[PDB]
Amino acid sequence: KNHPMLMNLLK
Amino acid sequence: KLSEEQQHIIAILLDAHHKTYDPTYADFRDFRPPVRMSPLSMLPHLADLVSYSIQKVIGFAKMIPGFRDLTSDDQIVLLKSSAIEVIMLRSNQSFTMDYKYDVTDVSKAGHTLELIEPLIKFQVGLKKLNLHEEEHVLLMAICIVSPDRPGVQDAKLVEAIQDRLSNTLQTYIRCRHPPPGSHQLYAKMIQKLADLRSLNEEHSKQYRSLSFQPENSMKLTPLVLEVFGN
Ligand SMILES: C=C1/C(=C\C=C2/CCC[C@]3(C)[C@@H]([C@H](C)CCCC(C)(C)O)CC[C@@H]23)C[C@@H](O)C[C@@H]1O
């Protein structure tokens, strides 16, 4: 899966 | 014996924690409200509290010295696998022996005593360690940067980052935590990290069960579904 939200929060 | 670099690491983690843990709960008013009386009446509120807290755990993690040197992929794997354990650790600060939560409340979010009894036992045992805030924030950081999480690629680097924090904690205990309080304290803190693995596993099992029903999955948040699984 992808983790676009987590990726965005990790900057 | 605490080096300048160790004092620096501790100051960075205290501030990181202060910047991501608001003990006034000023934000809780923006969650779906707790409902109290297969109801699951507390699932919306606790899902929003957990979703909020995952955001905070991520903010804390980004500030752990060394964490920035990992690849975005490894940062992801470490956060997904630790988020529930750091929520359990950080919640020890509100734990005490609308926004106080008891056993029935957690039951009303779709969980059972198989999770809740060991979770309360963990919170009591952690509270009894009476950790300094320095120790508490080091333990959360050590929990996040664990080299044995499944899917870690560059484990050597994660290990190296964690060793720096473990060494800081061990030295802090020796230098700043007076006996008797300090007796076996590091090993006891590591045992809590082991206890958290077992809690993580049982939470995962109950989460998969409650979220398997689309009507319950509907009540979660997009971030919770992404981090804990969908
Ligand atoms: C969150 C925080 C807090 C409490 C944590 C609790 C008490 C209620 C039950 C919770 C939320 C446990 C539940 C098993 C989590 C269930 C989540 C879900 C329904 C998605 O499977 C884990 C930690 C527990 C309050 C404050 O300390 C901030 C912290 O950050």
Side-chain angles (χ1 to χ4, degrees):
Chain A
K1 60 210 54 253
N2 289 247
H3 303 91
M5 275 164 300
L6 184 41
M7 175 79 69
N8 180 74
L9 294 164
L10 276 165
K11 110 151 283 93
Chain B
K1 174 101 74 172
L2 261 190
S3 76
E4 285 311 312
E5 173 171 282
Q6 290 165 339
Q7 289 170 68
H8 173 81
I9 285 174
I10 296 171
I12 283 330
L13 297 176
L14 286 174
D15 182 63
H17 180 57
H18 294 155
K19 281 182 160 128
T20 52
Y21 190 103
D22 169 21
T24 77
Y25 293 8
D27 291 316
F28 285 38
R29 292 179 178 327
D30 287 319
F31 300 162
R32 294 175 285 164
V35 179
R36 300 176 171 107
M37 298 149 165
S38 310
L40 280 25
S41 56
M42 284 296 292
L43 180 53
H45 180 76
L46 295 181
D48 282 350
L49 167 59
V50 166
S51 199
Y52 172 86
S53 294
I54 288 170
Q55 293 183 238
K56 301 307 185 184
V57 166
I58 294 159
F60 174 80
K62 286 173 67 161
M63 299 184 257
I64 294 175
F67 182 85
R68 78 176 160 197
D69 298 344
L70 300 167
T71 61
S72 95
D73 273 358
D74 272 340
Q75 298 182 16
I76 303 293
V77 164
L78 288 178
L79 275 156
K80 256 174 122 333
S81 53
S82 70
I84 186 67
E85 294 177 19
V86 183
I87 288 170
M88 290 174 174
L89 287 166
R90 79 201 306 272
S91 74
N92 186 250
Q93 177 165 351
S94 58
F95 181 82
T96 183
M97 299 197 284
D98 298 27
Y99 312 134
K100 184 194 187 306
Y101 310 106
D102 63 5
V103 172
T104 299
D105 287 335
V106 190
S107 308
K108 278 157 129 164
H111 287 291
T112 71
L113 219 56
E114 197 59 74
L115 177 58
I116 301 171
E117 192 257 5
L119 173 57
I120 291 170
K121 175 133 331 186
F122 167 83
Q123 292 300 347
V124 171
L126 178 56
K127 209 81 179 177
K128 291 179 169 179
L129 300 185
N130 199 11
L131 296 183
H132 292 189
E133 190 175 27
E134 289 79 355
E135 290 156 357
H136 182 64
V137 296
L138 278 162
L139 187 56
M140 284 186 301
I142 290 169
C143 179
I144 290 166
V145 181
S146 292
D148 63 321
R149 297 302 192 179
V152 177
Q153 300 288 354
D154 192 350
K156 289 310 189 190
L157 176 58
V158 175
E159 186 166 26
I161 290 168
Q162 197 195 50
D163 288 347
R164 177 152 37 106
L165 305 164
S166 299
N167 282 338
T168 298
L169 171 56
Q170 290 183 71
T171 298
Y172 179 89
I173 287 171
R174 285 193 220 220
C175 294
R176 302 278 193 87
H177 199 131
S182 59
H183 173 53
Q184 307 282 17
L185 176 63
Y186 178 71
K188 281 169 209 190
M189 297 175 66
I190 302 305
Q191 174 66 46
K192 283 290 157 287
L193 296 183
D195 292 348
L196 286 161
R197 299 302 180 90
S198 170
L199 291 169
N200 185 337
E201 168 168 3
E202 178 63 30
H203 175 264
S204 293
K205 180 167 186 66
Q206 298 192 13
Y207 175 88
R208 276 186 304 272
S209 160
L210 73 95
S211 68
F212 171 89
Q213 211 76 282
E215 54 262 64
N216 293 335
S217 167
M218 227 169 53
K219 299 291 204 246
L220 302 176
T221 68
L223 182 68
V224 165
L225 283 169
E226 178 184 298
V227 176
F228 289 170
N230 188 355

